[PDB]
Amino acid sequence: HIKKGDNVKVIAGKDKGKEGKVIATLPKKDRVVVEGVNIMKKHQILETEAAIHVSNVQLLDPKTNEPTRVGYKFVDGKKVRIAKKSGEEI
Amino acid sequence: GKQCFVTGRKASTGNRRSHALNSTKRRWNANLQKVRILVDGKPKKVWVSARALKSGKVT
RNA sequence: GAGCUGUAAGUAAGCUUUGAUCCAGAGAUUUCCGAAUGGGGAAACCCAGCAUGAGUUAUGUCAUGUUAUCGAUAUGUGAAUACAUAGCAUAUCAGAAGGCACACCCGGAGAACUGAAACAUCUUAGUACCCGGAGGAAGAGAAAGAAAAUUCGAUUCCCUUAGUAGCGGCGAGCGAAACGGGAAGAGCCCAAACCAACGUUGGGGUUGUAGGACACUCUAGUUACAAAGGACGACAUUAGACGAAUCAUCUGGAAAGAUGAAUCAAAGAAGGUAAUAAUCCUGUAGUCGAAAAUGUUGUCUCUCUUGAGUGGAUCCUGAGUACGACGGAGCACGUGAAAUUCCGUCGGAAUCUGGGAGGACCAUCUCCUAAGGCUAAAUACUCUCUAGUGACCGAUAGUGAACCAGUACCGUGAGGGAAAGGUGAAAAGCACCCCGGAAGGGGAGUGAAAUAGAACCUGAAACCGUGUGCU
RNA sequence: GAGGGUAGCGGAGAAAUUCCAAUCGAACCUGGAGAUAGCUGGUUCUCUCCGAAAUAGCUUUAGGGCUAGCCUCAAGUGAUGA
RNA sequence: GACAAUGGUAGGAGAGCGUUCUAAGGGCGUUGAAGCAUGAUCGUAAGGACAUGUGGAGCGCUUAGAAGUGAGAAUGCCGGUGUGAGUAGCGAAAGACGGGUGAGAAUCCCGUCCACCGAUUGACUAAGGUUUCCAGAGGAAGGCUCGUCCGCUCUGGGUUAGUCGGGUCCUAAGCUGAGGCCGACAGGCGUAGGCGAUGGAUAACAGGUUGAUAUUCCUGUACCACCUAUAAUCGUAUCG
RNA sequence: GACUCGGUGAAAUCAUAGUACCUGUGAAGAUGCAGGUUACCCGCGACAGGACGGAAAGACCCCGUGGAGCUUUACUGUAGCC
């Protein structure tokens, strides 16, 4: 759904409308870690990042650099991901 | 576990009544006799009712 | 198609695009007890024989197969006792055993409390309990029937007849059938007369408008009964994949809310997202997809197969059977004027001019053909598998059990049987400073909130303490 | 002392209605079963109008019933009431 | 307007309040819902509003429908908390002092004195219990007081057999029984044969050692059964 | 043992309680009613006249067309025996 090492835009939360890069994926709990957002403070005292819901992020279009949805069209024998509102392959 | 070998007679169950119509359980038994009959193997002694011995049976 | 080694943390050491982990179909391994089956036994243990093999100069030791009982089939099989037959030793057998849903069905045996305002006939009740046999359904089933019309035509189940006719210390009370309207709906095979062998196996034959043997000119495989084994392509389950549509400002920790402007809809069912979302995510409407296993179905294979009526010399059509008496039972019907049908004892018939029934019995009419055997459907029930619903409960409620509950615990034993749910959106679960031996507390810090600090959402009353105005 | 036997419509008793798991004129557990009780106890919000009886008869009846007397609501006849 | 009536047990009749759910219509709510607390408010009654604190996500209003619809009593059921009350009791009994440990000592360790049993409060072992046994740490709960201690908590350890008791030996009383007998079913009894010690048969003693084992480990000296290769003597042996 | 101090620390009972006496009254024997007479507020150790004092829904007597055990020339049956 949202693979690691992608470029996403946050649409809901404290750090909304801020682009980042996905660094970790937890599909059991449906949580995605985005770089640079949702900073946490743990008394051990260090500053690190926390997890955000996968439903609060949308992938960035390669051309317009705007949020969009995901689709599939079977260009080759395998399966590839495309973007709605356009035809560019992600 | 006693029964007629030729026909299959067996005891039954019923009521015993009095003049005042009080009822108690009783049994009607078959008139079985221990008689030797012809068998394919050894001639053995089996329970055969007196009714079966009528009409002509071996002994 | 990218993460994974369960709850469960946490630390190590690892695997994975050369396809980890996961879903589905198909295979292999599967300790010991338990019907337990080599013998024994206080289940989860002990002790052997026989045949091979592994190690020891040799015993000791170990591994792999087999050895229970009963029953059914071939062989050898003195007895006492001449031939034989009881006992015996072998060979074979997807032969039997035990459990299961305390639901449905058919048999054997069979109470009491209670009602009658006492009680014995009666009722409770052929109910509860016990035993036996099965099946996915079981039981019944092809007129010796119902009746009185210018008739019908196997069985089963629903409505009505009807609380009627009846039964009853005529008290309490018990209580039908036929007709009529519907669901479902096919009927056949054996014994005898007769025909050729050596009592046997084949053919023939199955009935009431009377059928058949005998003599007469005499032609639809139904594997759910009707006779029993196999080969031919289409749907349905057991994993899934595509699948339309939204952006701003205000409050706020967070927007899905409000104010404004757009879009989709064979998709406005539902769940989750930091708050109440048709257009954020998983989905829904619609369509597509199957290696392999398992069901149903239909077009050819394959396996059986004698189709019609007039005449009736003679012969055949179920015997200790029908029926009667005595003592019981069951029919709604308590022996009563009790027909119709079952059991025990004793007597005991006839052979189409025959026999049975039409509620004692006789006569006349009408209907039918017992004493042999099978048969799907409509009907009843839910331990389970998939998909759904409710003017049903919301932690003293709902299953006894929302937590690892038939658990704790109580009893020698059968048996009885609980209490216990909630931090926050995110563990971000208080670094650091001060009082101790520690528990605890005061600051600082995380968080919107810490009197949300894990004995954690709100937080009533009983009850226990501190200070104050009047007395 | 140890190993065993006799089981409730039954056992054992030098005999007391004595004992059979702290219980015995008939043990304990589970079912029929929510047995029966003409007998005690209990029965949850608020207002307005009307308002008794503790008597006769019968009764296997006497602290229980049934009919009649007395209370309440509705529809009818119309001086029949004190 | 004018008049008349309005005490009440059993019981009869009528109009109403409040709670939970459903249909339709119309509303409120993070600028704060239900719930909880207070107030000097409203109606003829059951009852209805408003404001302020806490609370953090749902809830009223109108007309109809339905019912697990209203609590002070049943020696009622379950949970919590009082009075008796700082009251009764703290389960046979002789302790005193010095030194240590420690935050804290009448109650814990070490030493001295005194005291009690001694046909037993001493030493073994059968049944039964099942880790309560040893060492090092700890003080929430258990100990009828305290506790630095423990049969209590945490972490690690401890049981060694040819000769001892049981089986590869034997049978009492009883139990189970191939065939067999009896019995509505289920099953009862019983022959050959087995199971079954509290009995019979059967080869080892002494000393030392650890915090925990001792006819078991070690040292010294024995015994019983079985197997293997030459041998004295033996082919009428010898075994049964 | 009880009594004082230190440590620990229950129970039966309980409608709410600021709980006097005499003569009367009363469902006929009053801390709570009438009249009068006594009595400043709060503790501790003792005794037992009352609170018809506390445990036990009176086993004595009676009632129920309630139970159970026993007896006989009560009634109706029956296991066995002739």
PDB file of N, CA and C (backbone and C1' of nucleotides) in Angstrom, chain C residues 217-250:
ATOM      1  P     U C 217     -53.466 -73.923 -33.265  1.00  0.00           P
ATOM      2  O5'   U C 217     -52.599 -72.605 -33.050  1.00  0.00           O
ATOM      3  C5'   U C 217     -51.290 -72.508 -33.591  1.00  0.00           C
ATOM      4  C4'   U C 217     -51.248 -71.595 -34.790  1.00  0.00           C
ATOM      5  C3'   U C 217     -50.537 -70.265 -34.592  1.00  0.00           C
ATOM      6  O3'   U C 217     -49.130 -70.379 -34.719  1.00  0.00           O
ATOM      7  C1'   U C 217     -52.607 -69.908 -35.688  1.00  0.00           C
ATOM      8  P     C C 218     -48.175 -70.251 -33.432  1.00  0.00           P
ATOM      9  O5'   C C 218     -48.080 -68.685 -33.169  1.00  0.00           O
ATOM     10  C5'   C C 218     -47.622 -67.797 -34.185  1.00  0.00           C
ATOM     11  C4'   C C 218     -47.998 -66.367 -33.884  1.00  0.00           C
ATOM     12  C3'   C C 218     -47.259 -65.734 -32.706  1.00  0.00           C
ATOM     13  O3'   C C 218     -47.059 -64.343 -32.959  1.00  0.00           O
ATOM     14  C1'   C C 218     -49.586 -65.777 -32.256  1.00  0.00           C
ATOM     15  P     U C 219     -45.653 -63.834 -33.548  1.00  0.00           P
ATOM     16  O5'   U C 219     -45.367 -62.476 -32.767  1.00  0.00           O
ATOM     17  C5'   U C 219     -45.919 -61.248 -33.215  1.00  0.00           C
ATOM     18  C4'   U C 219     -45.012 -60.085 -32.904  1.00  0.00           C
ATOM     19  C3'   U C 219     -43.618 -60.140 -33.508  1.00  0.00           C
ATOM     20  O3'   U C 219     -43.589 -59.736 -34.866  1.00  0.00           O
ATOM     21  C1'   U C 219     -43.471 -59.521 -31.229  1.00  0.00           C
ATOM     22  O5'   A C 220     -35.876 -45.532 -22.283  1.00  0.00           O
ATOM     23  C5'   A C 220     -36.547 -46.444 -23.139  1.00  0.00           C
ATOM     24  C4'   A C 220     -37.149 -47.591 -22.365  1.00  0.00           C
ATOM     25  C3'   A C 220     -36.165 -48.590 -21.777  1.00  0.00           C
ATOM     26  O3'   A C 220     -35.577 -48.145 -20.567  1.00  0.00           O
ATOM     27  C1'   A C 220     -37.932 -49.747 -22.844  1.00  0.00           C
ATOM     28  P     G C 221     -33.995 -47.871 -20.491  1.00  0.00           P
ATOM     29  O5'   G C 221     -33.383 -49.240 -19.953  1.00  0.00           O
ATOM     30  C5'   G C 221     -33.203 -50.351 -20.816  1.00  0.00           C
ATOM     31  C4'   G C 221     -31.924 -51.086 -20.505  1.00  0.00           C
ATOM     32  C3'   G C 221     -31.605 -51.268 -19.030  1.00  0.00           C
ATOM     33  O3'   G C 221     -32.310 -52.347 -18.442  1.00  0.00           O
ATOM     34  C1'   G C 221     -29.672 -50.528 -20.176  1.00  0.00           C
ATOM     35  P     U C 222     -32.733 -52.289 -16.893  1.00  0.00           P
ATOM     36  O5'   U C 222     -32.277 -50.840 -16.420  1.00  0.00           O
ATOM     37  C5'   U C 222     -32.471 -50.420 -15.074  1.00  0.00           C
ATOM     38  C4'   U C 222     -32.328 -48.926 -14.924  1.00  0.00           C
ATOM     39  C3'   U C 222     -32.870 -48.358 -13.615  1.00  0.00           C
ATOM     40  O3'   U C 222     -32.091 -47.227 -13.219  1.00  0.00           O
ATOM     41  C1'   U C 222     -34.059 -47.427 -15.438  1.00  0.00           C
ATOM     42  P     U C 223     -30.524 -47.392 -12.896  1.00  0.00           P
ATOM     43  O5'   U C 223     -30.337 -46.741 -11.452  1.00  0.00           O
ATOM     44  C5'   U C 223     -30.722 -47.441 -10.278  1.00  0.00           C
ATOM     45  C4'   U C 223     -29.535 -48.054  -9.572  1.00  0.00           C
ATOM     46  C3'   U C 223     -28.386 -47.116  -9.238  1.00  0.00           C
ATOM     47  O3'   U C 223     -28.609 -46.385  -8.045  1.00  0.00           O
ATOM     48  C1'   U C 223     -27.540 -49.109 -10.207  1.00  0.00           C
ATOM     49  P     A C 224     -29.026 -44.835  -8.096  1.00  0.00           P
ATOM     50  O5'   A C 224     -30.185 -44.720  -7.009  1.00  0.00           O
ATOM     51  C5'   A C 224     -30.008 -45.246  -5.703  1.00  0.00           C
ATOM     52  C4'   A C 224     -31.326 -45.594  -5.059  1.00  0.00           C
ATOM     53  C3'   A C 224     -32.260 -46.483  -5.866  1.00  0.00           C
ATOM     54  O3'   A C 224     -31.916 -47.857  -5.786  1.00  0.00           O
ATOM     55  C1'   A C 224     -33.476 -44.684  -4.902  1.00  0.00           C
ATOM     56  P     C C 225     -32.369 -48.878  -6.941  1.00  0.00           P
ATOM     57  O5'   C C 225     -33.593 -49.670  -6.305  1.00  0.00           O
ATOM     58  C5'   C C 225     -33.416 -50.492  -5.162  1.00  0.00           C
ATOM     59  C4'   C C 225     -34.727 -51.071  -4.694  1.00  0.00           C
ATOM     60  C3'   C C 225     -35.339 -52.149  -5.573  1.00  0.00           C
ATOM     61  O3'   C C 225     -34.774 -53.426  -5.330  1.00  0.00           O
ATOM     62  C1'   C C 225     -37.003 -50.585  -4.915  1.00  0.00           C
ATOM     63  P     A C 226     -33.877 -54.151  -6.447  1.00  0.00           P
ATOM     64  O5'   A C 226     -34.896 -54.434  -7.634  1.00  0.00           O
ATOM     65  C5'   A C 226     -35.973 -55.346  -7.471  1.00  0.00           C
ATOM     66  C4'   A C 226     -36.986 -55.194  -8.574  1.00  0.00           C
ATOM     67  C3'   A C 226     -36.422 -55.155  -9.985  1.00  0.00           C
ATOM     68  O3'   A C 226     -36.141 -56.441 -10.506  1.00  0.00           O
ATOM     69  C1'   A C 226     -37.942 -53.376  -9.706  1.00  0.00           C
ATOM     70  P     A C 227     -34.830 -56.682 -11.402  1.00  0.00           P
ATOM     71  O5'   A C 227     -33.613 -56.449 -10.399  1.00  0.00           O
ATOM     72  C5'   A C 227     -33.203 -57.466  -9.495  1.00  0.00           C
ATOM     73  C4'   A C 227     -31.753 -57.837  -9.695  1.00  0.00           C
ATOM     74  C3'   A C 227     -30.728 -56.774  -9.326  1.00  0.00           C
ATOM     75  O3'   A C 227     -30.441 -56.762  -7.937  1.00  0.00           O
ATOM     76  C1'   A C 227     -30.210 -57.673 -11.453  1.00  0.00           C
ATOM     77  P     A C 228     -29.297 -55.802  -7.341  1.00  0.00           P
ATOM     78  O5'   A C 228     -27.956 -56.649  -7.494  1.00  0.00           O
ATOM     79  C5'   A C 228     -26.697 -56.084  -7.160  1.00  0.00           C
ATOM     80  C4'   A C 228     -25.630 -56.483  -8.149  1.00  0.00           C
ATOM     81  C3'   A C 228     -24.524 -55.463  -8.373  1.00  0.00           C
ATOM     82  O3'   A C 228     -23.515 -55.508  -7.380  1.00  0.00           O
ATOM     83  C1'   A C 228     -25.334 -56.201 -10.461  1.00  0.00           C
ATOM     84  P     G C 229     -22.643 -54.196  -7.065  1.00  0.00           P
ATOM     85  O5'   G C 229     -21.562 -54.170  -8.236  1.00  0.00           O
ATOM     86  C5'   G C 229     -20.847 -52.984  -8.549  1.00  0.00           C
ATOM     87  C4'   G C 229     -19.556 -53.302  -9.258  1.00  0.00           C
ATOM     88  C3'   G C 229     -18.823 -52.129  -9.887  1.00  0.00           C
ATOM     89  O3'   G C 229     -18.082 -51.362  -8.953  1.00  0.00           O
ATOM     90  C1'   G C 229     -18.877 -53.947 -11.405  1.00  0.00           C
ATOM     91  P     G C 230     -17.700 -49.836  -9.287  1.00  0.00           P
ATOM     92  O5'   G C 230     -16.704 -49.954 -10.526  1.00  0.00           O
ATOM     93  C5'   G C 230     -16.413 -48.834 -11.349  1.00  0.00           C
ATOM     94  C4'   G C 230     -15.933 -49.265 -12.714  1.00  0.00           C
ATOM     95  C3'   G C 230     -15.583 -48.147 -13.686  1.00  0.00           C
ATOM     96  O3'   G C 230     -14.281 -47.628 -13.479  1.00  0.00           O
ATOM     97  C1'   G C 230     -16.940 -49.751 -14.776  1.00  0.00           C
ATOM     98  P     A C 231     -13.921 -46.122 -13.912  1.00  0.00           P
ATOM     99  O5'   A C 231     -13.702 -46.204 -15.489  1.00  0.00           O
ATOM    100  C5'   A C 231     -13.391 -45.042 -16.245  1.00  0.00           C
ATOM    101  C4'   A C 231     -13.599 -45.269 -17.722  1.00  0.00           C
ATOM    102  C3'   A C 231     -13.894 -44.024 -18.554  1.00  0.00           C
ATOM    103  O3'   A C 231     -12.713 -43.335 -18.939  1.00  0.00           O
ATOM    104  C1'   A C 231     -15.485 -45.699 -19.050  1.00  0.00           C
ATOM    105  P     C C 232     -12.746 -42.147 -20.027  1.00  0.00           P
ATOM    106  O5'   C C 232     -14.161 -41.444 -19.824  1.00  0.00           O
ATOM    107  C5'   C C 232     -14.334 -40.062 -20.116  1.00  0.00           C
ATOM    108  C4'   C C 232     -15.262 -39.845 -21.286  1.00  0.00           C
ATOM    109  C3'   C C 232     -15.873 -38.453 -21.396  1.00  0.00           C
ATOM    110  O3'   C C 232     -15.015 -37.522 -22.033  1.00  0.00           O
ATOM    111  C1'   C C 232     -17.569 -40.085 -21.640  1.00  0.00           C
ATOM    112  P     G C 233     -14.722 -36.092 -21.362  1.00  0.00           P
ATOM    113  O5'   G C 233     -15.574 -35.061 -22.231  1.00  0.00           O
ATOM    114  C5'   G C 233     -15.257 -33.671 -22.228  1.00  0.00           C
ATOM    115  C4'   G C 233     -16.494 -32.803 -22.188  1.00  0.00           C
ATOM    116  C3'   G C 233     -16.266 -31.383 -21.674  1.00  0.00           C
ATOM    117  O3'   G C 233     -17.224 -30.508 -22.275  1.00  0.00           O
ATOM    118  C1'   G C 233     -17.751 -32.497 -20.232  1.00  0.00           C
ATOM    119  P     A C 234     -17.068 -28.910 -22.162  1.00  0.00           P
ATOM    120  O5'   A C 234     -18.273 -28.467 -21.216  1.00  0.00           O
ATOM    121  C5'   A C 234     -18.116 -27.408 -20.280  1.00  0.00           C
ATOM    122  C4'   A C 234     -19.343 -27.228 -19.418  1.00  0.00           C
ATOM    123  C3'   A C 234     -19.129 -26.497 -18.101  1.00  0.00           C
ATOM    124  O3'   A C 234     -19.117 -25.089 -18.251  1.00  0.00           O
ATOM    125  C1'   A C 234     -20.420 -28.445 -17.725  1.00  0.00           C
ATOM    126  P     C C 235     -18.873 -24.140 -16.979  1.00  0.00           P
ATOM    127  O5'   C C 235     -20.309 -24.011 -16.300  1.00  0.00           O
ATOM    128  C5'   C C 235     -20.482 -23.264 -15.106  1.00  0.00           C
ATOM    129  C4'   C C 235     -21.447 -23.929 -14.157  1.00  0.00           C
ATOM    130  C3'   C C 235     -21.129 -23.765 -12.679  1.00  0.00           C
ATOM    131  O3'   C C 235     -21.578 -22.528 -12.156  1.00  0.00           O
ATOM    132  C1'   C C 235     -21.625 -26.034 -13.135  1.00  0.00           C
ATOM    133  P     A C 236     -20.690 -21.740 -11.075  1.00  0.00           P
ATOM    134  O5'   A C 236     -20.667 -22.715  -9.816  1.00  0.00           O
ATOM    135  C5'   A C 236     -21.847 -22.981  -9.073  1.00  0.00           C
ATOM    136  C4'   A C 236     -21.532 -23.721  -7.799  1.00  0.00           C
ATOM    137  C3'   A C 236     -20.267 -23.278  -7.083  1.00  0.00           C
ATOM    138  O3'   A C 236     -20.483 -22.123  -6.292  1.00  0.00           O
ATOM    139  C1'   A C 236     -20.348 -25.648  -7.189  1.00  0.00           C
ATOM    140  P     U C 237     -19.282 -21.479  -5.447  1.00  0.00           P
ATOM    141  O5'   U C 237     -19.250 -22.343  -4.111  1.00  0.00           O
ATOM    142  C5'   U C 237     -18.197 -22.186  -3.177  1.00  0.00           C
ATOM    143  C4'   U C 237     -17.901 -23.469  -2.444  1.00  0.00           C
ATOM    144  C3'   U C 237     -16.503 -23.571  -1.864  1.00  0.00           C
ATOM    145  O3'   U C 237     -16.398 -22.906  -0.619  1.00  0.00           O
ATOM    146  C1'   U C 237     -17.052 -25.584  -2.989  1.00  0.00           C
ATOM    147  P     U C 238     -15.401 -21.662  -0.453  1.00  0.00           P
ATOM    148  O5'   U C 238     -14.037 -22.347  -0.005  1.00  0.00           O
ATOM    149  C5'   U C 238     -14.037 -23.332   1.015  1.00  0.00           C
ATOM    150  C4'   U C 238     -12.826 -24.221   0.927  1.00  0.00           C
ATOM    151  C3'   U C 238     -11.509 -23.529   0.628  1.00  0.00           C
ATOM    152  O3'   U C 238     -10.954 -22.879   1.758  1.00  0.00           O
ATOM    153  C1'   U C 238     -11.697 -25.484  -0.687  1.00  0.00           C
ATOM    154  P     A C 239     -10.818 -21.279   1.776  1.00  0.00           P
ATOM    155  O5'   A C 239      -9.901 -20.957   0.513  1.00  0.00           O
ATOM    156  C5'   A C 239      -9.640 -19.618   0.121  1.00  0.00           C
ATOM    157  C4'   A C 239      -8.167 -19.389  -0.104  1.00  0.00           C
ATOM    158  C3'   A C 239      -7.750 -17.964  -0.422  1.00  0.00           C
ATOM    159  O3'   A C 239      -7.669 -17.140   0.728  1.00  0.00           O
ATOM    160  C1'   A C 239      -6.663 -19.459  -1.898  1.00  0.00           C
ATOM    161  P     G C 240      -7.895 -15.555   0.604  1.00  0.00           P
ATOM    162  O5'   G C 240      -6.852 -15.111  -0.514  1.00  0.00           O
ATOM    163  C5'   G C 240      -6.940 -13.841  -1.140  1.00  0.00           C
ATOM    164  C4'   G C 240      -6.567 -13.923  -2.597  1.00  0.00           C
ATOM    165  C3'   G C 240      -6.667 -12.625  -3.379  1.00  0.00           C
ATOM    166  O3'   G C 240      -5.521 -11.808  -3.210  1.00  0.00           O
ATOM    167  C1'   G C 240      -7.685 -14.376  -4.607  1.00  0.00           C
ATOM    168  P     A C 241      -5.658 -10.211  -3.193  1.00  0.00           P
ATOM    169  O5'   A C 241      -5.919  -9.836  -4.717  1.00  0.00           O
ATOM    170  C5'   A C 241      -5.003 -10.217  -5.732  1.00  0.00           C
ATOM    171  C4'   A C 241      -5.458  -9.730  -7.083  1.00  0.00           C
ATOM    172  C3'   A C 241      -6.036  -8.328  -7.106  1.00  0.00           C
ATOM    173  O3'   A C 241      -5.024  -7.337  -7.148  1.00  0.00           O
ATOM    174  C1'   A C 241      -7.439  -9.792  -8.332  1.00  0.00           C
ATOM    175  P     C C 242      -5.403  -5.780  -7.063  1.00  0.00           P
ATOM    176  O5'   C C 242      -5.770  -5.401  -8.563  1.00  0.00           O
ATOM    177  C5'   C C 242      -6.303  -4.126  -8.871  1.00  0.00           C
ATOM    178  C4'   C C 242      -7.226  -4.182 -10.059  1.00  0.00           C
ATOM    179  C3'   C C 242      -8.300  -3.110 -10.090  1.00  0.00           C
ATOM    180  O3'   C C 242      -7.817  -1.872 -10.577  1.00  0.00           O
ATOM    181  C1'   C C 242      -9.269  -5.213 -10.570  1.00  0.00           C
ATOM    182  P     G C 243      -7.845  -0.571  -9.637  1.00  0.00           P
ATOM    183  O5'   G C 243      -9.388  -0.187  -9.580  1.00  0.00           O
ATOM    184  C5'   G C 243     -10.164  -0.149 -10.768  1.00  0.00           C
ATOM    185  C4'   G C 243     -11.617  -0.418 -10.482  1.00  0.00           C
ATOM    186  C3'   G C 243     -12.227   0.385  -9.348  1.00  0.00           C
ATOM    187  O3'   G C 243     -12.584   1.702  -9.733  1.00  0.00           O
ATOM    188  C1'   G C 243     -12.830  -1.887  -9.114  1.00  0.00           C
ATOM    189  P     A C 244     -11.561   2.920  -9.496  1.00  0.00           P
ATOM    190  O5'   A C 244     -12.467   4.222  -9.626  1.00  0.00           O
ATOM    191  C5'   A C 244     -12.797   4.765 -10.899  1.00  0.00           C
ATOM    192  C4'   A C 244     -13.721   5.947 -10.756  1.00  0.00           C
ATOM    193  C3'   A C 244     -13.330   6.945  -9.676  1.00  0.00           C
ATOM    194  O3'   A C 244     -12.411   7.912 -10.157  1.00  0.00           O
ATOM    195  C1'   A C 244     -15.615   6.358  -9.434  1.00  0.00           C
ATOM    196  P     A C 245     -11.283   8.524  -9.191  1.00  0.00           P
ATOM    197  O5'   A C 245     -12.006   9.760  -8.494  1.00  0.00           O
ATOM    198  C5'   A C 245     -12.584  10.804  -9.265  1.00  0.00           C
ATOM    199  C4'   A C 245     -13.700  11.484  -8.513  1.00  0.00           C
ATOM    200  C3'   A C 245     -13.330  12.041  -7.146  1.00  0.00           C
ATOM    201  O3'   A C 245     -12.738  13.327  -7.217  1.00  0.00           O
ATOM    202  C1'   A C 245     -15.304  10.756  -6.963  1.00  0.00           C
ATOM    203  P     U C 246     -11.215  13.552  -6.756  1.00  0.00           P
ATOM    204  O5'   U C 246     -11.291  13.644  -5.167  1.00  0.00           O
ATOM    205  C5'   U C 246     -12.241  14.488  -4.523  1.00  0.00           C
ATOM    206  C4'   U C 246     -11.639  15.811  -4.118  1.00  0.00           C
ATOM    207  C3'   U C 246     -10.659  15.766  -2.944  1.00  0.00           C
ATOM    208  O3'   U C 246      -9.676  16.782  -3.134  1.00  0.00           O
ATOM    209  C1'   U C 246     -12.428  17.216  -2.422  1.00  0.00           C
ATOM    210  P     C C 247      -8.111  16.422  -3.154  1.00  0.00           P
ATOM    211  O5'   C C 247      -7.402  17.799  -2.779  1.00  0.00           O
ATOM    212  C5'   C C 247      -7.771  18.522  -1.612  1.00  0.00           C
ATOM    213  C4'   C C 247      -8.057  19.971  -1.921  1.00  0.00           C
ATOM    214  C3'   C C 247      -7.897  20.945  -0.763  1.00  0.00           C
ATOM    215  O3'   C C 247      -6.550  21.333  -0.553  1.00  0.00           O
ATOM    216  C1'   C C 247      -9.949  21.359  -1.860  1.00  0.00           C
ATOM    217  P     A C 248      -6.124  22.083   0.802  1.00  0.00           P
ATOM    218  O5'   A C 248      -6.602  23.588   0.585  1.00  0.00           O
ATOM    219  C5'   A C 248      -6.596  24.514   1.661  1.00  0.00           C
ATOM    220  C4'   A C 248      -7.465  25.715   1.377  1.00  0.00           C
ATOM    221  C3'   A C 248      -7.919  26.500   2.599  1.00  0.00           C
ATOM    222  O3'   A C 248      -6.938  27.419   3.052  1.00  0.00           O
ATOM    223  C1'   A C 248      -9.771  26.105   1.179  1.00  0.00           C
ATOM    224  P     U C 249      -6.274  27.245   4.504  1.00  0.00           P
ATOM    225  O5'   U C 249      -7.184  28.140   5.459  1.00  0.00           O
ATOM    226  C5'   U C 249      -7.262  29.548   5.289  1.00  0.00           C
ATOM    227  C4'   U C 249      -8.523  30.107   5.899  1.00  0.00           C
ATOM    228  C3'   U C 249      -8.710  29.851   7.388  1.00  0.00           C
ATOM    229  O3'   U C 249      -8.046  30.817   8.185  1.00  0.00           O
ATOM    230  C1'   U C 249     -10.703  29.306   6.223  1.00  0.00           C
ATOM    231  P     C C 250      -7.669  30.508   9.716  1.00  0.00           P
ATOM    232  O5'   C C 250      -9.077  30.360  10.449  1.00  0.00           O
ATOM    233  C5'   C C 250      -9.821  31.498  10.866  1.00  0.00           C
ATOM    234  C4'   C C 250     -10.869  31.114  11.881  1.00  0.00           C
ATOM    235  C3'   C C 250     -10.371  30.242  13.026  1.00  0.00           C
ATOM    236  O3'   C C 250      -9.830  31.015  14.082  1.00  0.00           O
ATOM    237  C1'   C C 250     -12.336  29.291  12.093  1.00  0.00           C
TER     238        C C 250
END
